[PDB]
C-alpha cells in the first residue's frame, strides 16, 4: 500500500522507543525552528545522558507565500532526535529507521552530502551532512560542537527529519495539498485554515504598533527573571521575544541598520541565559548521571 502521514509518525515513534529514546510532547510557545525548543537547547549542556525523539510544528513568518507555492509554507512539521552521548552507531540506526519506515534501501540512492550548520542567533555550530534520496533533501545530520558559548562535553548527535516532503516525494504527488493525512482524509483540506489566514496576518494586517513595544518588554522581563536565578521562564520568554522580531521582519518595517542591533541583543540575552542552566544543575548533584573518559 501507500504510506499515509498519520502512520509515518506511528512508525517513527515506536522505532525510536525501542532503541531507548524517551518520546515527549511538542513545544508550547511558537518556535521559529526545530532547535530552539527548551528540550534541546538547554538540555545538551552538562554531562548527563539524554536520548529524546519528538515531533514539533515549526512556524516561520518570513517564508509565507499565501499557501500557493508547493515548496514553502508558514507551518511545517519536523521530527527531532537528540542522542547524547553518541553510541558509535550514529548513522546506522538512521538507515535502519529509514528501512523500517517503509522505503527500501537497496533500491534508492541514499547518499550524504556535506553541509556545515551554524546559527549566530543562539551561538551554535557543528559538523554534519544532509541526506539526499534521489535528489531530495529529506534529513539533516549534525554532530554539535558548541551551544551558546560553552563547549559541548560530550558532543551530541542531532537528526532532523523534514516530514512534510518525505511523503510528498514518496507517494508521488506533485502539489502539497495532495498529501493524504489518513485513509479517507487529506492534508490540504484541514491544514489550510491555519495557512491562509496566518499568511494574510503575517503579510499585510500584522499591527506593528504592538510588536515593537512587546519586543523590548519581553527582553526586559527576561533579563529581570534571569537576574533572580529562574532559568526556565527566563528562557521561555526569549522564544516569544524572538518570534516578535521575525514577525517584524515579515511585515518589512526593520531597516538594514537595526538588524545588527536586534541580533546582538538577542544573542547577548541567549548567551547570558544559557550559562545559568549549567550553574543551576550542578548544585543538584547531576541526578541523571555523569560521563567520564
Amino acid at each position: 500500500s501507500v504510506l499515509t502521514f498519520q502512520q509515518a509518525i506511528q512508525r517513527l515513534q515506536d522505532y525510536w522507543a525501542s532503541v531507548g529514546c524517551a518520546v515527549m510532547q511538542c513545544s508550547n510557545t511558537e518556535v521559529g525552528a526545530g532547535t530552539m525548543n527548551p528540550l534541546t537547547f538547554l538540555r545538551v549542556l552538562g554531562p548527563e545522558p539524554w536520548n529524546v525523539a519528538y515531533v514539533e510544528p515549526s512556524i516561520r513568518p518570513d517564508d509565507s507565500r499565501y499557501g500557493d507555492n508547493p515548496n514553502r509554507l508558514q507551518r511545517h512539521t519536523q521530527f527531532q532526535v537528540i542522542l547524547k552521548p553518541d553510541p558509535g552507531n550514529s548513522q546506522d540506526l538512521f538507515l535502519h529507521s529509514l528501512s523500517a519506515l517503509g522505503i527500501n534501501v537497496r533500491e534508492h540512492d541514499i547518499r550524504f552530502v556535506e553541509d556545515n550548520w551554524e546559527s549566530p542567533v543562539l551561538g551554535a555550530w557543528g559538523l554534519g551532512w544532509e541526506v539526499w534520496m534521489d535528489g531530495m533533501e529529506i534529513t539533516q545530520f549534525t554532530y554539535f560542537q558548541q551551544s551558546g558559548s560553552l563547549p559541548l562535553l560530550p558532543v551530541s548527535v542531532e537528526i532532523t527529519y523534514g516530514l512534510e516532503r518525505i511523503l510528498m516525494s514518496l507517494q508521488g504527488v506533485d502539489h502539497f495539498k495532495n498529501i493524504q493525512y489518513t485513509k479517507g482524509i487529506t492534508y490540504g483540506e484541514l491544514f489550510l485554515e491555519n495557512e491562509k489566514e496566518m499568511s494574510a496576518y503575517y503579510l499585510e494586517h500584522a499591527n506593528v504598533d504592538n510588536i515593537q513595544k512587546h519586543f523590548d518588554d519581553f527582553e526586559e522581563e527576561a533579563r529581570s527573571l534571569l537576574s533572580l536565578w529562574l532559568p526556565i521562564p527566563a528562557y521561555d520568554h526569549v522564544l516569544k521575544a524572538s518570534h516578535a522580531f521575525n514577525i517584524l521582519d515579515s511585515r518589512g518595517f526593520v531597516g538594514v541598520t537595526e538588524r545588527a542591533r536586534y541580533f546582538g541583543r538577542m544573542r547577548s540575552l541567549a548567551r547570558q541565559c544559557a550559562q545559568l542552566w549549567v550553574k543551576t544543575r550542578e548544585n543538584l548533584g547531576y541526578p541523571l548521571g555523569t560521563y567520564q573518559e
Binding site: 533500491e107 534508492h108 534520496m133 535528489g135 516525494s169 541598520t257
Partner: protein, 348 residues
C-alpha cells in the same frame, strides 16, 4: 605488514585485519588474509579505490549515453572534480524533462543543473543549444527505473519555480527596478546601492575623459549608467547569486535597446573570479574602472583596510581586477588624478 598485524591503538580503536565495503551489500565486512592481496579484494567488492580511475569510467560512459539522443555532455573541471569524490562506485543514468522549459534563458537551466543537483547538461552536436536530457551519477547497485522516476520529478519541480519567478520578473521592464534596489545596503556609513549608482553616473564623465575616449561616444555612456547594475534587485537573481551581471544584459536585449549598451551592462562585473575574461569594449571599461575606484575610495574613507588573513570586503580582489583591466587593455591612465575626482562626490 606481510602476514602479521602491526599492533597500535588510535582514538580507542585497535588496528586489525577487517575492512567494510559497500553498505547493505553482501560484503558488509571482509577479512584480508595478507597485505599483498588487498587491492585485488576491493575491486572484488566493486569499489574503484583509485582516484583517477573513476574519471575514466565516468567520462567513458557519460559520452556513450549521449549518442543515444545524438549529443554531447558538458564537463566543467570544477564539477567533475567534485562529482568524482562523492561516489564509491559510479553508475551513470540519463533522464528526460519536458521541452516547455526551453523558453528560459540558456544560462539559467545550466546553473540550476550544475550548482544545486550536480547533473550533466546535454547539448546537440548540430544546432548547439540545450537538449531535453540530463545525466546523473548514482552510487552502487541500485534499481535503474526508480532513480530516474524519482529524480526527474525533482528536476521538473525546480523548473516550475524558476519559470514562475522569470514570468513574474518580466512583467515590468528593467527601468522600474532601479528604484526598488534600496533594500540592499552597501555600507553602514555609505548607504545603499542607489547612492553608489548615482555617484558612478555623476563621476563617469571625468573618467571617460582621462582615458582619452572620443567625445562622440560620450552620450551612450551617460545612458548606460542610467541602467547600470539594476539586475541585483530582480527576482531571478535574488536566489541565483551567480547570475548577477548577465541577466541584466538579457533584460536589456529583450527591452529593445542597442547592442552597444547591453555589452556595457554585462561587462560591469568582469572579472568575477580569477581566470575569467576581461572587458573588451570601450564603454564597458569606463564603467568597470569607475565602479572599482568608487568602491575603493568609499571603503577606504571609513578605514576598513583588510589584513593578511581576513577579507571584510575583498579589497585586494578589487585592486587586482583594476590593475588587470588597466594593463591587459593598453590604456593610459593617471591614478592620482582620477582618485581625487572620485573622492570629490563622496558624502563625507
Amino acid at each position: 605488514h606481510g602476514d602479521l598485524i602491526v599492533p597500535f591503538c588510535f582514538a580507542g580503536i585497535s588496528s586489525g585485519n577487517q575492512s567494510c565495503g559497500l553498505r547493505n551489500s553482501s560484503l558488509a565486512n571482509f577479512k584480508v588474509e595478507a597485505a599483498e592481496l588487498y587491492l585485488h579484494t576491493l575491486e572484488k567488492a566493486g569499489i574503484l579505490i583509485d582516484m583517477q580511475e573513476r574519471k575514466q569510467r565516468i567520462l567513458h560512459d557519460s559520452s556513450i549515453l549521449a549518442e543515444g539522443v545524438g549529443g554531447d555532455i558538458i564537463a566543467p573541471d570544477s564539477l567533475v572534480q567534485e562529482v568524482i569524490n562523492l561516489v564509491e562506485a559510479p553508475m551513470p543514468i540519463i533522464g528526460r524533462y519536458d521541452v516547455s522549459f526551453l523558453a528560459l534563458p540558456k544560462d539559467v537551466l545550466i546553473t540550476v543543473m550544475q550548482k544545486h543537483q550536480k547533473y550533466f547538461p546535454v547539448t546537440s552536436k548540430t544546432m548547439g543549444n540545450l537538449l531535453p536530457c540530463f545525466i546523473t551519477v548514482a552510487n552502487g547497485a541500485i534499481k535503474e527505473e526508480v532513480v530516474r522516476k524519482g529524480n526527474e520529478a525533482v528536476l521538473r519541480a525546480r523548473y516550475e519555480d524558476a519559470k514562475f519567478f522569470y514570468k513574474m520578473d518580466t512583467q515590468k521592464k528593467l527601468s522600474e527596478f532601479r528604484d526598488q534596489l534600496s533594500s540592499i545596503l552597501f555600507h553602514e556609513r555609505l548607504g545603499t546601492m542607489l547612492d553608489k549608482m548615482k555617484r558612478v553616473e555623476n563621476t563617469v564623465a571625468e573618467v571617460a575623459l582621462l582615458l582619452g575616449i572620443n567625445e562622440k561616444m560620450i552620450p551612450a555612456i551617460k545612458d548606460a549608467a542610467a541602467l547600470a547594475m539594476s539586475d541585483l534587485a530582480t527576482n531571478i537573481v535574488t536566489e541565483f547569486t551567480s547570475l548577477a551581471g548577465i541577466m541584466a544584459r538579457h533584460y536589456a536585449l529583450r527591452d529593445g535597446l542597442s547592442e552597444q549598451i547591453a555589452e556595457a551592462l554585462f561587462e560591469i562585473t568582469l572579472p568575477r573570479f580569477s581566470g575569467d575574461v576581461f572587458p573588451k569594449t570601450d564603454p564597458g571599461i569606463v564603467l568597470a574602472v569607475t565602479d572599482r575606484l568608487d568602491s575603493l575610495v568609499g571603503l577606504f574613507g571609513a578605514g576598513c583596510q583588510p589584513s593578511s588573513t581576513n577579507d571584510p570586503f575583498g579589497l585586494r580582489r578589487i585592486s587586482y581586477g583594476l590593475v588587470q583591466i588597466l594593463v591587459e587593455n593598453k590604456k593610459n591612465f593617471d591614478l592620482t588624478k582620477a582618485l581625487t575626482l572620485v573622492a570629490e562626490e563622496q558624502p563625507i
